Design a protein around this motif. Sequence first.
Motif, mmCIF file in Angstrom:
data_model
loop_
_atom_site.group_PDB
_atom_site.id
_atom_site.type_symbol
_atom_site.label_atom_id
_atom_site.label_comp_id
_atom_site.label_asym_id
_atom_site.label_seq_id
_atom_site.Cartn_x
_atom_site.Cartn_y
_atom_site.Cartn_z
ATOM 1 N N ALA A 2 55.347 41.503 30.549
ATOM 2 C CA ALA A 2 54.413 41.409 31.689
ATOM 3 C C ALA A 2 53.831 40.007 31.748
ATOM 4 C CB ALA A 2 53.233 42.332 31.380
ATOM 5 N N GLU A 3 53.375 39.583 32.904
ATOM 6 C CA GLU A 3 52.696 38.251 32.986
ATOM 7 C C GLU A 3 51.193 38.454 32.617
ATOM 8 O OE1 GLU A 3 53.767 39.152 37.039
ATOM 9 O OE2 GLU A 3 53.083 40.667 35.660
ATOM 10 N N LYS A 9 47.364 33.459 27.155
ATOM 11 C CA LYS A 9 47.765 32.293 26.295
ATOM 12 C C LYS A 9 48.234 31.079 27.119
ATOM 13 C CE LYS A 9 48.029 35.821 23.435
ATOM 14 N NZ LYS A 9 47.832 37.178 24.034
ATOM 15 N N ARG A 10 48.338 31.185 28.436
ATOM 16 C CA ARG A 10 48.759 30.022 29.259
ATOM 17 C C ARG A 10 47.526 29.215 29.745
ATOM 18 N NH1 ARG A 10 52.335 32.367 28.971
ATOM 19 N NH2 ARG A 10 53.543 33.515 30.493
ATOM 20 N N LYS A 16 46.684 27.927 36.212
ATOM 21 C CA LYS A 16 47.145 29.360 36.245
ATOM 22 C C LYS A 16 45.994 30.304 35.847
ATOM 23 C CE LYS A 16 50.491 27.982 36.126
ATOM 24 N NZ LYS A 16 51.656 27.271 36.735
ATOM 25 N N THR A 17 45.279 30.813 36.834
ATOM 26 C CA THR A 17 44.135 31.773 36.580
ATOM 27 C C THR A 17 43.052 31.102 35.684
ATOM 28 O OG1 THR A 17 44.672 33.020 34.505
ATOM 29 C CG2 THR A 17 46.100 33.416 36.420
#
Length: 17
Positions: A2-3, A9-10, A16-17
């Motif tokens: 899943a993303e 962790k990104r 990104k969010t």
Amino acid sequence: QAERMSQIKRLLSEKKT
């Protein structure tokens, strides 16, 4: 897989969010 759990962790990615 899943993303979701990887999304947390990104925080180091450009925008990104």
